[PDB]
Design a protein around this nucleic acid. Sequence first.
RNA 1: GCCCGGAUAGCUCAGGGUAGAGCAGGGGAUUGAAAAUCCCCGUGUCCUUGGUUCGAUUCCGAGUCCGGGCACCA
RNA 2: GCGGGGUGGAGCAGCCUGGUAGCUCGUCGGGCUCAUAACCCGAAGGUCGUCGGUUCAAAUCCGGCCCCCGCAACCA
RNA 3: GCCCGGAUAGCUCAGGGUAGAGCAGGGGAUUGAAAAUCCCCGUGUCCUUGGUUCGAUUCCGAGUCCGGGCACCA
RNA 4: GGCGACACACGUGCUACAAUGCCCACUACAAAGCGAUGCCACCCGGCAACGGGGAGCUAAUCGCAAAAAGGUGGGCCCAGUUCGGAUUGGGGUCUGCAACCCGACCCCAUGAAGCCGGAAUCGCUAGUAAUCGCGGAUCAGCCAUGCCGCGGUGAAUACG
Lengths: 23, 123, 69, 155
Amino acid sequence: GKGDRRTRRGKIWRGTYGKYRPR
Amino acid sequence: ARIAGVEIPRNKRVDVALTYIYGIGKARAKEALEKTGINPATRVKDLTEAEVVRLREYVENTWKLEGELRAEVAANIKRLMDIGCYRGLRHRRGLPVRGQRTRTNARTRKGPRKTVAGKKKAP
Amino acid sequence: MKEGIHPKLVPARIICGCGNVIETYSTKPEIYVEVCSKCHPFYTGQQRFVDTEGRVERFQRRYGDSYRK
Amino acid sequence: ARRRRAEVRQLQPDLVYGDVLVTAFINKIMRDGKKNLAARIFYDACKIIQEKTGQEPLKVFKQAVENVKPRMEVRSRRVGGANYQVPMEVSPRRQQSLALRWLVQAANQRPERRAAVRIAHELMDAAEGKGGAVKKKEDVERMAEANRAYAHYRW
RNA sequence: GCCCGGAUAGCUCAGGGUAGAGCAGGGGAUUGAAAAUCCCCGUGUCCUUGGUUCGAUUCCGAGUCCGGGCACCA
RNA sequence: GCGGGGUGGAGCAGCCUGGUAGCUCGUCGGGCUCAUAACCCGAAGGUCGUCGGUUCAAAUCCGGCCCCCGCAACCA
RNA sequence: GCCCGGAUAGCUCAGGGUAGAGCAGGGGAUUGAAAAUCCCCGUGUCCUUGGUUCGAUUCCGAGUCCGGGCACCA
RNA sequence: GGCGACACACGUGCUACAAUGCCCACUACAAAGCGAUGCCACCCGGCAACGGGGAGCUAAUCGCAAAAAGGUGGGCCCAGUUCGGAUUGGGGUCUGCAACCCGACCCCAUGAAGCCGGAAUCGCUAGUAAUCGCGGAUCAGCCAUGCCGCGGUGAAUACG
Ligand SMILES: [K+]
Ligand SMILES: [Mg+2]
Ligand SMILES: [Mg+2]
Ligand SMILES: [Mg+2]
Ligand SMILES: [Mg+2]
Ligand SMILES: [Mg+2]
Ligand SMILES: [Mg+2]
Ligand SMILES: [Mg+2]
Ligand SMILES: [Mg+2]
Ligand SMILES: [Mg+2]
Ligand SMILES: [Mg+2]
Ligand SMILES: [Mg+2]
Ligand SMILES: [Mg+2]
Ligand SMILES: [Mg+2]
Ligand SMILES: [Mg+2]
Ligand SMILES: [Mg+2]
Ligand SMILES: [Mg+2]
Ligand SMILES: [Mg+2]
Ligand SMILES: [Mg+2]
Ligand SMILES: [Mg+2]
Ligand SMILES: [Mg+2]
Ligand SMILES: [Mg+2]
Ligand SMILES: [Mg+2]
Ligand SMILES: [Mg+2]
Ligand SMILES: [Mg+2]
Ligand SMILES: [Mg+2]
Ligand SMILES: [Mg+2]
Ligand SMILES: [Mg+2]
Ligand SMILES: [Mg+2]
Ligand SMILES: [Mg+2]
Ligand SMILES: [Mg+2]
Ligand SMILES: [Mg+2]
Ligand SMILES: [Mg+2]
Ligand SMILES: [Mg+2]
Ligand SMILES: [Mg+2]
Ligand SMILES: [Mg+2]
Ligand SMILES: [Mg+2]
Ligand SMILES: [Zn+2]
């Protein structure tokens, strides 16, 4: 869910990247 | 008590089942199976005792888990209180520790609302 | 012993994950176990597992003495 | 709507069955404006009603609609010292809306796990006169029949 | 002590092939509120036992237990 | 002298028949209202006058003490 | 004269580790300014004496200012 | 130092309670804006926040840039769960003189309440509501889930 930083959707929501959402 | 001290649920995949252990999130699950060479998608019911002990042996020796981890977490909080920093003081009264507001909310730390009389109005 | 009410104890072999094998007596002929005396951390030497830490803290911190003199 | 009647919307007939009533039905399935997703469900349900009980889905769907159509209903009204439960007949437009609305509602209360199955099964039971949406329709008609005493209060 | 009665759903009571209705409870419609009204649903060896029947809450022998009723008390 | 009574803040159940403290109002939080009342939705508060006893267990049964009401006190 | 009960701030009254409420008065918030409400402050040898107690407004023993009751007789 | 307090009470919101959903991989289609101790292509180090390099652009040219819901494939199988992501332990990163009170991120671990919400109450009549992402102003950084905007997909109903 959007409040879960440990996910793609979550990093998108917070507008950030990382292991769980790469660029 | 199969592994580590807990019985991970059969009829689910290993990678998920390992998570039910205190100290294993999904990330350590993927890595442990890779490092020991077992399919992440195989139901716990369907593991050779060879797979079982190999997976078991790895997991317990690689990371500190369950009780030991809880104890180590407990010692840390205990340390903060005894010194005792502002962080330690917060643990004493069971308030948030990471700078959240307490005028509202904070229910997870504070618990259920203990309602109290307010201030009456004139007539 | 009283007839009829007790379960038979028979020669039995208990097997651990560490390959340990125990020759004893039980109600079950063969039994497989996750741990035993031979491989349990507390029993075996002091096999301190993952935690060598003690604990570490606080001034193993070091890193370093860089702030000047 | 004080001034004039509301224009009744005309909807584009669906691409597969070429039926406007199908379109309206697709709309009641649609949540959050995901029409594409909703259209799949209906069409996939149509696949299912095709293989189970081998009739033409369109004929099954249309039949299920007619059966859930309420001829009568109670509608609140006035009158001074109390608001009565007055039995009024249902307009063809309203008849259609309700059955489609209920059909989805009963469909989403079915126990089956996935949507296309729920829709298909409710449509199957509803065409055969069984099913939740039908039960509502009969309920509504019972209430209307029941308050026949306050008929003269109708407009 | 003898007759005349009953037991049936949480309550109130109705009746060879049957299992009821009214209220309580539940949801829904309705609403300012409280009801009222309306639609649906839940609540049984029809006290126990033993028999008649093709079978029975039902007939009957029967025991349990509250109903009544009438007499007597050295 | 004899009878009854003492239990959430108020007024009353519960005791006879030991195990389970209830009802109306009041109080506290929230709704409706421009606002108050009425009203509607939630919640808290009584270890039962005290001491002693019986009992596995006492508001409850038995005593003792403090109260609080009521009735009596006649023949001279 | 004989039993029971109250003496606690200026008033009216709660209640074993020198204690409170209201009201009165002073501030302060509120207000256009007031009322009301809310907040804060001052308030005292807790009637006298003896006793018990490390410790008494508190428990005791009296006493006291006063409050309900007892009183020819035939 | 405090405006960031916390037994409590209200408003406006964010994220959810899941299968018309969640996840991983792969693959598309916007608009309006911003940008010279600025936006930063691409290369390499790091699981990563980032770091070192290092072109292009004073910008209809260079860059922020990937739009997301969607589409395709597979996994999950009704579980307080691969739903939810609060709380807490630990380890890091960056701005900054300085993140104790009191920053935003990243990673490992933790994985709370929540099973659709009492009385009550809000918005919207069409490219609207719902849902999905994008940008800007303020600004070192940022507690923005706020605000002002931009498009994507796209309803239901109005008897009276
Ligand atoms: K006389
Ligand atoms: Mg998740
Ligand atoms: Mg785990
Ligand atoms: Mg704070
Ligand atoms: Mg032997
Ligand atoms: Mg007889
Ligand atoms: Mg009855
Ligand atoms: Mg009292
Ligand atoms: Mg009383
Ligand atoms: Mg009463
Ligand atoms: Mg009594
Ligand atoms: Mg009793
Ligand atoms: Mg109130
Ligand atoms: Mg005005
Ligand atoms: Mg009021
Ligand atoms: Mg007594
Ligand atoms: Mg006792
Ligand atoms: Mg008791
Ligand atoms: Mg006792
Ligand atoms: Mg003034
Ligand atoms: Mg004295
Ligand atoms: Mg004197
Ligand atoms: Mg402020
Ligand atoms: Mg918000
Ligand atoms: Mg900017
Ligand atoms: Mg859980
Ligand atoms: Mg729970
Ligand atoms: Mg989870
Ligand atoms: Mg930390
Ligand atoms: Mg800081
Ligand atoms: Mg569920
Ligand atoms: Mg939902
Ligand atoms: Mg309009
Ligand atoms: Mg969403
Ligand atoms: Mg934004
Ligand atoms: Mg900023
Ligand atoms: Mg913050
Ligand atoms: Zn062993």
